[PDB]
mmCIF file of C-alpha atoms in Angstrom:
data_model
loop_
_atom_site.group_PDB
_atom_site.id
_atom_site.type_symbol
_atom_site.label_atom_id
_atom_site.label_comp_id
_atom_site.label_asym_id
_atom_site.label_seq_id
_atom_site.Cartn_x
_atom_site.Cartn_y
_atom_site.Cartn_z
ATOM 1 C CA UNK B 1 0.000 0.000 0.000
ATOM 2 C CA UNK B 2 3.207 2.552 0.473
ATOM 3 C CA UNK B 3 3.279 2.288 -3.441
ATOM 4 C CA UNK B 4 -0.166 4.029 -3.285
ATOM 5 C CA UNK B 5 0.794 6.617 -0.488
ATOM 6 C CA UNK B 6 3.014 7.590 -3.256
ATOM 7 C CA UNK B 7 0.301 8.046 -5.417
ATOM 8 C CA UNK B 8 -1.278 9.630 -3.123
ATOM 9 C CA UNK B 9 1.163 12.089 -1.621
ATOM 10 C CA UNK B 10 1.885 13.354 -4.812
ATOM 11 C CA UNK B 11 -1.952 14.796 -5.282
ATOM 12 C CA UNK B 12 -1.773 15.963 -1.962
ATOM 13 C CA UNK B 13 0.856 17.988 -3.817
ATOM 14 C CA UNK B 14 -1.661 19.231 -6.469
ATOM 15 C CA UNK B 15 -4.130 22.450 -5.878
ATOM 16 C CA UNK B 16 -7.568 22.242 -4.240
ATOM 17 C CA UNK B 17 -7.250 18.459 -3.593
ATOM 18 C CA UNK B 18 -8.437 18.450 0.110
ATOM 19 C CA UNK B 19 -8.409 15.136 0.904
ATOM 20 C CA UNK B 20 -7.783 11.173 -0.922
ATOM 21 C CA UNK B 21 -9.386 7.521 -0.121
ATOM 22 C CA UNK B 22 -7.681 4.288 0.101
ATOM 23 C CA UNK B 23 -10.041 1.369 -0.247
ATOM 24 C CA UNK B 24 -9.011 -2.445 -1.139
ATOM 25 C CA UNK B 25 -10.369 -5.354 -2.781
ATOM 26 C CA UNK B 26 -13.105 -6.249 -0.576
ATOM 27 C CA UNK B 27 -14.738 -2.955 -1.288
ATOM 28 C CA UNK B 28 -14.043 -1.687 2.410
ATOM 29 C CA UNK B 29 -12.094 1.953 2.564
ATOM 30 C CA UNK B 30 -9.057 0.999 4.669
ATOM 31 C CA UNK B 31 -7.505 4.529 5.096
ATOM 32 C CA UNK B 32 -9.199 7.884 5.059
ATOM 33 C CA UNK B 33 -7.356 11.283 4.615
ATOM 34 C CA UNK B 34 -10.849 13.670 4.706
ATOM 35 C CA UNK B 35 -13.103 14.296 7.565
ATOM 36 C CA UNK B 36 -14.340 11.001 8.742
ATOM 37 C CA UNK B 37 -17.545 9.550 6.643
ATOM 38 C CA UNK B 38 -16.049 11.297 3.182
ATOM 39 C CA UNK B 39 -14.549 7.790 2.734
ATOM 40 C CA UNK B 40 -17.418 5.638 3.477
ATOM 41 C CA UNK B 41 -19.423 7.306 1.342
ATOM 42 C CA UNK B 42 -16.907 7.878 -2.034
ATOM 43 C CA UNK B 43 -16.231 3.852 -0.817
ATOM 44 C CA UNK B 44 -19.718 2.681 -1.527
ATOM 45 C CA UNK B 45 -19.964 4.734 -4.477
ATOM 46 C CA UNK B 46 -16.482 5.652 -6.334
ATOM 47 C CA UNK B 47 -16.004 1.627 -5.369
ATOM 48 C CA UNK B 48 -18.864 0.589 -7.822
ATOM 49 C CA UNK B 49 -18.058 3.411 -10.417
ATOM 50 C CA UNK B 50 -14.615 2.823 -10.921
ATOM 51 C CA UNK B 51 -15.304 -0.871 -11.247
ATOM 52 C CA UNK B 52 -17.774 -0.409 -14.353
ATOM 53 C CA UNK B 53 -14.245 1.160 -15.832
ATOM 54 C CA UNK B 54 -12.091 -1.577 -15.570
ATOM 55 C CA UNK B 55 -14.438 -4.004 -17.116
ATOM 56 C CA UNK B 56 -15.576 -1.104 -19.872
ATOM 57 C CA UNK B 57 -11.777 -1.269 -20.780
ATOM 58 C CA UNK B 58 -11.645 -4.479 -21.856
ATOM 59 C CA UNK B 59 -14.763 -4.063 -23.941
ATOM 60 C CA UNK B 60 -13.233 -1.908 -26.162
ATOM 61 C CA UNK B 61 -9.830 -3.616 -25.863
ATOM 62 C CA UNK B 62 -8.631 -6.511 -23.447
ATOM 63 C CA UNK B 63 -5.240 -5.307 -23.776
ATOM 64 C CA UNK B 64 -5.070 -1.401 -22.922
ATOM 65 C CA UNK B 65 -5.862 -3.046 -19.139
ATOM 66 C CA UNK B 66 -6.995 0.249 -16.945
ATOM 67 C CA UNK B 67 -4.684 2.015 -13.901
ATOM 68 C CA UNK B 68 -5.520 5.224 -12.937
ATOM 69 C CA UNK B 69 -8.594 7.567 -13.840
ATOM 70 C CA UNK B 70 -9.689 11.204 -13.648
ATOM 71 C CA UNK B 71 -12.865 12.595 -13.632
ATOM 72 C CA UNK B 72 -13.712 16.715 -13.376
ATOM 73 C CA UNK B 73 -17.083 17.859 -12.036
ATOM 74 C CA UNK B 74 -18.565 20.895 -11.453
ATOM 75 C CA UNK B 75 -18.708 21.207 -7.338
ATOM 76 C CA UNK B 76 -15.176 19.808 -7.683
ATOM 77 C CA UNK B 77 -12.861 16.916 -9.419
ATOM 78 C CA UNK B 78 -11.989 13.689 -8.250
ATOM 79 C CA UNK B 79 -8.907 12.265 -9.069
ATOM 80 C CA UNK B 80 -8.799 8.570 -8.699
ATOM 81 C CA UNK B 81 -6.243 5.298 -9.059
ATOM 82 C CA UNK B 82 -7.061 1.570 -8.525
ATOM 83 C CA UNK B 83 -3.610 0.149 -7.088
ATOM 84 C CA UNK B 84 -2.855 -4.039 -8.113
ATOM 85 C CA UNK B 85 -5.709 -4.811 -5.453
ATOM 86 C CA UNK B 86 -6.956 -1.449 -4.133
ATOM 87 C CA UNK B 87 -8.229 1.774 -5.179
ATOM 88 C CA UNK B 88 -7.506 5.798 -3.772
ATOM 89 C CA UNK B 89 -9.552 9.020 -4.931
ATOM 90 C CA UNK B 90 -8.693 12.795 -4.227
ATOM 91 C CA UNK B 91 -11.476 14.908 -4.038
ATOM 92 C CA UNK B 92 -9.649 18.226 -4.937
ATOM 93 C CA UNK B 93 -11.329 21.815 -6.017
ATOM 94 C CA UNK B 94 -11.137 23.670 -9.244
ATOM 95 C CA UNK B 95 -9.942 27.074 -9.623
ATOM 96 C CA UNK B 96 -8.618 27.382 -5.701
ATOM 97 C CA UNK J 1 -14.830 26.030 -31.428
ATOM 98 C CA UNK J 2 -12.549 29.053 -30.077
ATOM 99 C CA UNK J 3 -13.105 28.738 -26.912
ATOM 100 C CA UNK J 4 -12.407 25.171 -27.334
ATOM 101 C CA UNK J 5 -9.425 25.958 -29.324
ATOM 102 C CA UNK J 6 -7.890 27.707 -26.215
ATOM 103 C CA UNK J 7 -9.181 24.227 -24.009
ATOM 104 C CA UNK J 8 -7.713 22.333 -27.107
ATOM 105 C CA UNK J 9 -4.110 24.541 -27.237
ATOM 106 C CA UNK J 10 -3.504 24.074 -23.442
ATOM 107 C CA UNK J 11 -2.696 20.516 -23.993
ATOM 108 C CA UNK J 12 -0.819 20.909 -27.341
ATOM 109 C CA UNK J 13 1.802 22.179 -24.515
ATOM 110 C CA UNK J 14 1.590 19.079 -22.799
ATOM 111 C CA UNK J 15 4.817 16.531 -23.608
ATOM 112 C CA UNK J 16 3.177 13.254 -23.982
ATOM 113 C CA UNK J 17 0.467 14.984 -25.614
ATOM 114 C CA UNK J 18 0.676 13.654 -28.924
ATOM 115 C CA UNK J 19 -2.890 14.346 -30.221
ATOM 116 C CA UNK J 20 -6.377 15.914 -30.098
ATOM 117 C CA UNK J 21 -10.138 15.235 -31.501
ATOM 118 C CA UNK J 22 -13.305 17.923 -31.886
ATOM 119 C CA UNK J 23 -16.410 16.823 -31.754
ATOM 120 C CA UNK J 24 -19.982 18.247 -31.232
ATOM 121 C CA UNK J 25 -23.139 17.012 -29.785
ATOM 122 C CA UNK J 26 -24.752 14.983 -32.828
ATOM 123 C CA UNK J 27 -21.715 12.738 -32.150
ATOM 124 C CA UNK J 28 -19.706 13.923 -35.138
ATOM 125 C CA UNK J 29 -16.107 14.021 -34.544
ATOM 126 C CA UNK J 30 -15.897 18.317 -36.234
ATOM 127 C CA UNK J 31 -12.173 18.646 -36.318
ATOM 128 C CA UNK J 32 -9.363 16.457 -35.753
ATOM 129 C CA UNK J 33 -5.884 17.013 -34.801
ATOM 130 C CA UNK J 34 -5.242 13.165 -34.886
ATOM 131 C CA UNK J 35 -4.904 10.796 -37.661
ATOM 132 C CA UNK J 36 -7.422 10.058 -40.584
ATOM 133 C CA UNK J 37 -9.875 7.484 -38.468
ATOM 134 C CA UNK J 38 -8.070 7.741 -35.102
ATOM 135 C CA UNK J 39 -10.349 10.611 -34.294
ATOM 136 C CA UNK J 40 -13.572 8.246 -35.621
ATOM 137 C CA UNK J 41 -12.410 5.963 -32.910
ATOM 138 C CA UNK J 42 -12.709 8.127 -30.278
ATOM 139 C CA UNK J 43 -15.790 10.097 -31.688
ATOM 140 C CA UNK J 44 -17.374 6.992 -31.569
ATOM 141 C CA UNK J 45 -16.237 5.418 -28.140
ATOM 142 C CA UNK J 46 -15.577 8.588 -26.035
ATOM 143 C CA UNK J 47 -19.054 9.372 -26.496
ATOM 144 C CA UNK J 48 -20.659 6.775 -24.698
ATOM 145 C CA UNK J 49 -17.733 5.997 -22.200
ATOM 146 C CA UNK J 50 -18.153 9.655 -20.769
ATOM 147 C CA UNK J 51 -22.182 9.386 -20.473
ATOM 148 C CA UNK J 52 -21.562 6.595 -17.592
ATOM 149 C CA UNK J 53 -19.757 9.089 -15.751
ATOM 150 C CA UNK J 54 -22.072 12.073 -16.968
ATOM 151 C CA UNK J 55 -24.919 9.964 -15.236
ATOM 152 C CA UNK J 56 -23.300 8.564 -12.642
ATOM 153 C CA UNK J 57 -22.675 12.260 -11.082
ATOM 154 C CA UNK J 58 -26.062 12.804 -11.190
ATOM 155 C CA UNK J 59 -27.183 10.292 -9.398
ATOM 156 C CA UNK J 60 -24.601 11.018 -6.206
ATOM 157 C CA UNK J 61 -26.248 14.288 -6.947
ATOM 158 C CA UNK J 62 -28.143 15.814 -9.889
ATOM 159 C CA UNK J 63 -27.124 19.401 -8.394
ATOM 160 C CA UNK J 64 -23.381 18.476 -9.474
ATOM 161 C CA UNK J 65 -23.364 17.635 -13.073
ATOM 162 C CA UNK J 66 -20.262 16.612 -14.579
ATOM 163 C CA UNK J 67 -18.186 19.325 -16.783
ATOM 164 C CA UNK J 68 -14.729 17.217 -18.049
ATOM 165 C CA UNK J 69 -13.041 13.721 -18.286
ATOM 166 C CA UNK J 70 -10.140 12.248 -18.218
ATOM 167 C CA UNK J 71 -8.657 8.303 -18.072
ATOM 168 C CA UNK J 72 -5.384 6.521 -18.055
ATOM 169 C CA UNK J 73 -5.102 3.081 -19.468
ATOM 170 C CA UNK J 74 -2.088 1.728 -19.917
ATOM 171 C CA UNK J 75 -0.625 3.337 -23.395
ATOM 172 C CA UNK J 76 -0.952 6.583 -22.328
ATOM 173 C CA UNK J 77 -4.299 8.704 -21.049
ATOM 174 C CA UNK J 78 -6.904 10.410 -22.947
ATOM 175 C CA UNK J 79 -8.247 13.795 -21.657
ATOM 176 C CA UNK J 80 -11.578 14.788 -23.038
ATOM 177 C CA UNK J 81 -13.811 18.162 -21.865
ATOM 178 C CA UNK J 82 -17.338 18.341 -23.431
ATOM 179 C CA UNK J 83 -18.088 21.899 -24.002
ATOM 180 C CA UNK J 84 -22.321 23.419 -24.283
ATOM 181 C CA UNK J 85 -22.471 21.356 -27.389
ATOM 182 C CA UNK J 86 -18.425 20.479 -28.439
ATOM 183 C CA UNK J 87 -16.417 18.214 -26.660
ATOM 184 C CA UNK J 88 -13.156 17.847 -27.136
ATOM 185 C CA UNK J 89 -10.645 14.665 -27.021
ATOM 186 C CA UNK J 90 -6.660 14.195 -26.115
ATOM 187 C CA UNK J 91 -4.287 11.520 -26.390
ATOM 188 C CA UNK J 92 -1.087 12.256 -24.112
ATOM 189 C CA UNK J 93 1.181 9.504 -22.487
ATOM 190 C CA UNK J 94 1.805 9.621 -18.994
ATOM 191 C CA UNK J 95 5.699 9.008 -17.318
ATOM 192 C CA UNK J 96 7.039 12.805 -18.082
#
């Protein structure tokens, strides 16, 4: 998981991103750097959502497998990035 | 497709940025800064892979509509932004 607190340490870096989510394979958020439910709830949502990605992927080709995604919103952005068996997401703010 | 062009020109600064794709709301890929059919490709795919997301942010909350994209498989990661009625596409590869 230290791989992933490097890919996660380096959004901290990045403007507006407040906080990230580390959840594994299970579908349970193991670590949580925002206030204190942020991660349960991006964990039993972001957790579904970024699995209809990794499947989509193959779809259109089995070989470009997925690793990391990036969605921008209008409240905010997520940035996201589904380690070998777990997943993180960085809830950071536009124009900050 | 101005206003786009100055969304479209900010990448052309990117490094890995090797590419880019116009395309409006009828699903027609307008310009292309790619080759011949690459831009068919993802005129054709980007379109539907960003309306699972465009949805999806709805539901969590219909207040917060989505505004940009942006994935990373494992060639390199395509950015896309879908204007009032253009969106846009990008092809740059990731490792700086």
């Amino acid at each position: 998981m230290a791989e992933v607190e490097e890919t996660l340490k380096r959004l901290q870096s990045q403007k507006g991103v407040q906080g990230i989510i580390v959840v594994n394979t299970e579908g349970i958020p193991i670590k949580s750097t925002m206030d204190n439910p942020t991660t349960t709830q991006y964990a039993s949502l972001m957790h579904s959502f970024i699995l209809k990605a990794r499947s989509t992927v193959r779809d259109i080709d089995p070989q470009n497998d997925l690793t990391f995604l990036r969605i921008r919103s209008k409240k905010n952005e997520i940035m996201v990035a589904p380690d070998k068996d777990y997943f993180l997401i960085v809830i950071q703010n536009p124009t900050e």
